[PDB]
Amino acid sequence: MDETGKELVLALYDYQEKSPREVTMKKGDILTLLNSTNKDWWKVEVNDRQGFVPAAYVKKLD
Protein backbone atom coordinates (compact mmCIF):
# COMPACT_ATOMS: atom_id res chain seq x y z
CA MET A 1 0.00 0.00 0.00
CA ASP A 2 1.07 3.59 -0.63
CA GLU A 3 -0.01 6.98 0.72
CA THR A 4 -3.19 6.91 -1.34
CA GLY A 5 -5.18 8.25 1.60
CA LYS A 6 -8.64 6.79 1.12
CA GLU A 7 -7.92 3.08 0.97
CA LEU A 8 -10.89 0.84 0.25
CA VAL A 9 -11.32 -2.92 0.13
CA LEU A 10 -13.17 -5.01 -2.42
CA ALA A 11 -15.48 -7.65 -0.98
CA LEU A 12 -14.86 -10.67 -3.20
CA TYR A 13 -17.07 -12.85 -1.01
CA ASP A 14 -20.59 -12.70 0.38
CA TYR A 15 -20.17 -12.52 4.13
CA GLN A 16 -23.26 -12.32 6.30
CA GLU A 17 -22.84 -10.90 9.80
CA LYS A 18 -23.50 -13.29 12.68
CA SER A 19 -22.04 -11.36 15.60
CA PRO A 20 -23.12 -7.74 16.32
CA ARG A 21 -19.49 -6.67 15.84
CA GLU A 22 -19.56 -7.99 12.27
CA VAL A 23 -20.99 -6.22 9.24
CA THR A 24 -22.79 -7.48 6.14
CA MET A 25 -20.77 -7.29 2.94
CA LYS A 26 -21.48 -8.91 -0.41
CA LYS A 27 -19.30 -9.74 -3.39
CA GLY A 28 -18.94 -6.54 -5.37
CA ASP A 29 -19.21 -4.15 -2.43
CA ILE A 30 -16.45 -1.59 -2.11
CA LEU A 31 -15.96 -0.83 1.57
CA THR A 32 -13.95 1.81 3.42
CA LEU A 33 -10.97 0.45 5.38
CA LEU A 34 -10.89 2.18 8.77
CA ASN A 35 -8.68 -0.14 10.86
CA SER A 36 -6.01 -2.74 10.08
CA THR A 37 -4.31 -3.11 13.47
CA ASN A 38 -5.40 -6.72 13.23
CA LYS A 39 -4.02 -8.54 10.20
CA ASP A 40 -6.85 -11.06 10.50
CA TRP A 41 -9.69 -8.68 11.33
CA TRP A 42 -10.29 -5.45 9.44
CA LYS A 43 -12.85 -2.77 10.24
CA VAL A 44 -14.79 -1.97 7.11
CA GLU A 45 -17.66 0.45 6.58
CA VAL A 46 -20.67 -0.02 4.34
CA ASN A 47 -22.53 3.29 3.88
CA ASP A 48 -22.61 4.01 7.63
CA ARG A 49 -22.13 0.57 9.18
CA GLN A 50 -18.78 -0.53 10.61
CA GLY A 51 -17.58 -3.92 11.79
CA PHE A 52 -14.70 -6.36 11.94
CA VAL A 53 -14.44 -8.97 9.21
CA PRO A 54 -11.75 -11.53 8.27
CA ALA A 55 -9.38 -9.89 5.79
CA ALA A 56 -9.32 -13.10 3.72
CA TYR A 57 -12.77 -12.23 2.37
CA VAL A 58 -11.71 -8.80 1.11
CA LYS A 59 -9.13 -7.58 -1.39
CA LYS A 60 -6.87 -4.63 -0.60
CA LEU A 61 -6.70 -1.98 -3.30
CA ASP A 62 -3.18 -0.50 -3.54
Notes on the structure:
By secondary structure, the chain is mainly β. The chain has one domain (1-62). The protein contains no helices and 5 strands. The chain has strands at 8-11, 30-35, 41-46, 49-54, 58-60. The protein has a 5-stranded antiparallel sheet, with no helix packed on it. Strand 3 (41-46) and strand 4 form a beta hairpin.
Q: Could you list some keywords that capture this structure?
A:
globular; peptide binding protein; protein dynamics; 62 residues; integrated structural biology
Strand order of the main beta sheet, please?
Answer: 4-3-2-1-5
The share of residues in helices is under 10%
Biggest pleated-sheet summary: 5 strands, antiparallel
Number of strands: 5
Question: Which sequence of SSEs, written as H and E, runs from N to C?
Answer: EEEEE
- Helix count, per DSSP? 0
- Straight-line distance between termini: 5 Å
Radius of gyration based on Cα positions: 11 Å
| Class by alpha and beta content | mainly beta
Count of domain modules: 1
Strand residues, percent: 35-45%
